[PDB]
């Protein structure tokens, strides 16, 4: 059995996006399908339902008329056409199979789920990060501040992947600006500070930034 | 419509002990008579990133392959998910769900972590970089490294005046090996204001510390 | 009091319970399931199928008008009014050995209520009688005054 969601990235408020779910391991053409979203927070919310033949499609009141559920049984694929997107639609969209037997009314029991696809709606355009060092002053702490970037994510490695132990990369914090700020740190022995060269290698693919900054002691 | 509320927000139990999540519905989800009494309630396990899985349905029936340590229980309005003997693998978020009325609704879910011995945080302060100071902004950072429990108080102090609203916190997920947390506290100030003050301090209050710990610097340096 | 009847084609029969309208179709498709849905035992369970109380009675008349004996005959399955799928009441009228007899019952009853009724059922194949309140999502376009003009 397999459900693999595809599509979904970052969109500007008001634009459109299309999500697809590839299904295998069951009789797709006979089972009822669903779209359930998980907003950054905790809440798991139902979005849409579709019958084996598309005759009966039902939407949650939040999305009703903006979204459109469709399916292609020949390709065993489920679709959600999302238009007139809003910030409130920011969520991980999971595609799920209803436990309801063939031609039976929807049981609202979600037997199988896919890994989910992230959909981010924000008016913030793509911006590269500014990387400043967190200069050290029997163990010492070194770091990198990765301030003002969009969208997520950013990848931090130390000494180009050589430095691994005691690396703590904190989750991104969204600022008032609508831009993300992230911090990365590493604990190193005090004795090595004079000898060893410490460089964090920051990588933000959407803005195509690659930086690598050396952290020099005070 | 139906509101599922789950409690407690996150719990931590030692390896092997019993875990107990509570779920409460705003309206009964029980259908009775014939002979049959069914409870239209389901339980789900969601580990990080991974596909959420169906555990229990009919509030007590185990989905094929779910180990017997998972016990679904309750009736009408109050439900409980019990993990008889917690395993490292069982660390996840658990959601309860109602399917008695349309639309189907879910809980906020409990997060299940491991309960370990107290671990004091190691405290570190960092002044804003000159690189950033020429940029027109200033960022003072405070690190609390490898500690347990997650609960700790970070207070920022600029020239002995306490700071509020101007700071932001970030916390790592419980570590895979030692199951400790780490915390980042970022005090964000205008270049202007930063240059007008001298003492910058960060005060940590934790279970593992005998007394509050203070990490501070002067602007003069 | 009596609910006025009417038919359009071979699988399109109608009923009007005062103000409310109800669509009666035959299906081969087992839409409602046992163990998931509300079994109707007595006429009082019927109120759990319709938003209204002044609906319940017209249904109750028709079911008994068909030949349904509440005391012995098998409970009809119904879709709860909690599910926003609509209001659906179905009778297990299958030509399968179990509900073989009940099948003959409701069918003779139909042939008596509606002059234009013919047995659409297949021998040794599932057969159901589906009813939907007009205005409901499950009743669809069929309840529009376009199909309902052709009737009394
Ligand atoms: C409606 O009635 C039919 C006939 O009794 C049911 O179908 C039979 O179900 C039993 C048990 O599952 C089987 O042994 C028979 O082989 C089935 N008969 C047919 C026609 O194939 C049907 O299940 C009833 N409706 C539901 C969904 O409960």
Numbering used by the authors:
A (entry chain B): 2 to 138, 145 to 225
B (entry chain A): 1 to 221
C (entry chain R): 87 to 238
Verbatim from the authors:
The arenavirus surface glycoprotein complex (GPC) is the target of neutralizing antibodies. GPC comprises three functional subunits: the stable signal peptide (SSP), GP1, and GP2.9 GP1 binds cellular receptor(s), and GP2 contains a transmembrane domain (TM) and mediates membrane fusion. During attachment of New World arenaviruses to their cellular receptor transferrin receptor 1 (TfR1),10–12 a GP1 pocket accepts a tyrosine (Tyr211TfR1) that is conserved in all TfR1 orthologs that can support the entry of these viruses. We determined X-ray crystal structures of JUNV GP1 with the weakly cross-reactive antibody Fab and of MACV GP1 with the potently cross-neutralizing antibody Fab.
A complex of MACV GP1/CR1-07 Fab crystallized in the P42212 space group, with diffraction extending to 3.9 Å. CDR L1 and CDR H3 clasp the C-terminal segment of GP1 loop 3, and CDR L1 forms additional contacts with the GP1 β-4 strand. Comparison with the GD01 structure shows that the angle of approach is different and that the tip of CR1-07 CDR H3 shifts away from the GP1 Tyr211TfR1 pocket. Instead of engaging the cavity, two tyrosines in CR1-07 CDR H3 interact with Ile115 and Val117 on the rim of the pocket; these are the only two pocket residues conserved in MACV and JUNV GP1; MACV GP1 residues Arg111, Ser113, and Thr216 are respectively replaced by a serine, aspartate, and lysine in JUNV GP1. The other GP1 residues CR1-07 contacts are conserved between JUNV and MACV GP1, but not among the other viruses. This suggests that CR1-07 would nonetheless tolerate substitutions at these positions and that most of its binding energy is contributed by conserved contacts elsewhere in the RBS. On the other hand, the drastically different angle of approach of the CR1-07 Fab allows its CDRs to avoid any clashes with MACV loop 10. Efficient cross-neutralization is thus achieved by avoidance of the MACV loop 10 insert, a unique segment that best exemplifies the extensive sequence variability seen within the RBS of New World arenaviruses. CR1-07 would approach GPC with a steeper angle, with its CDR L1 forming contacts near the trimer apex.
